[model samples]
Target: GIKQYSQEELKEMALVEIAHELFEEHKKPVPFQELLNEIASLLGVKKEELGDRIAQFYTDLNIDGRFLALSDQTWGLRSWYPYDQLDEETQLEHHHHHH
Candidate 1:
């Protein structure tokens, strides 16, 4: 008999899974393109179709609040690096007030 998996089980295969996998693959922050390629491949989306997923992916990352965009244009797990490691200009940019 086939096992039944709930919607919650299906949700497990999405962005967060891929993110942690990528995070584990690198000891340091890797380049954006490299991460992007790995993510796209894992999601079964080609580079051309990558843009379509960007908005949703970024939104997911933002809500998860576990990913960070670094000073050198790389994306990494926020838990992996201290906020102070970002360059001065980037720190300023990142800390900018929304109000």
Candidate 2:
């Protein structure tokens, strides 16, 4: 029998967790659209719905401390990029005010 994931089961997962796993496996930054698309794909979300949800997803990533939005429109794990090498402005953007 084929295994399947239920909506509840999938919803229990964090998008950042999926993105982190993807980055870990690929060892490279992922484009914004590609990253969101992959997350939607894993969550069983359709492309049609993804268009409407992209903004919200982007915001969610921005709020998550583990993610880093690169200048080239790519996203990567914060740990992948060295903290010391980050410029002042980039560091300001990623400032962790609250847990």
Candidate 3:
């Protein structure tokens, strides 16, 4: 069965999942930095949130979303959606705020 993730976790989970979808479809991997930037651009979140692993709000999602802490600085989706399946729209959306 697929593990369920929390909303905050879902954000990055969905972002990573969606980004992964975007990567494979477009042949571009959206690095963690870019994904965070795009998400911040879309929802009008603060910049500080992206840098820290223990995000103020995202902490709950990290636990509820059933994600893996691949590394201290790693950001990615849960096991359900592997990176290989992602599309490039994530990376292509480099001009998040401007575009």
lDDT of each: 0.55, 0.61, 0.42
Summarize candidate 2's per-residue lDDT along 1-99 as a digit string, tens digits.
Answer: 002335565466555655555555455688887877777777778746766456766677778766777787888766555663232223323345552
Best-first order by TM-score: 2, 1, 3
Runs in model 2 lying further than 4 Å from the true structure: 1-10, 50-53, 81-99
Candidate 1 local lDDT, 1-99, one digit each (tens): 002324444335665545654564443675666777776665556856857567776677657645667776677666445554232223311323453
lDDT of 3 by residue, 1-99 (tens): 012333455455534343333333334234455656655654356657656643632555345433344555454444335442232334322323543
List TM-scores for all candidates, in order: 0.53, 0.58, 0.34
Quality of model 3 by C-alpha lDDT: 0.42
Error of 1 at 43 (Å): 3.4
The candidate scoring highest on TM-score is 2
Clash statistics: count for each candidate? 0, 0, 13
Worst 10 residues of 1 by lDDT: 87-96
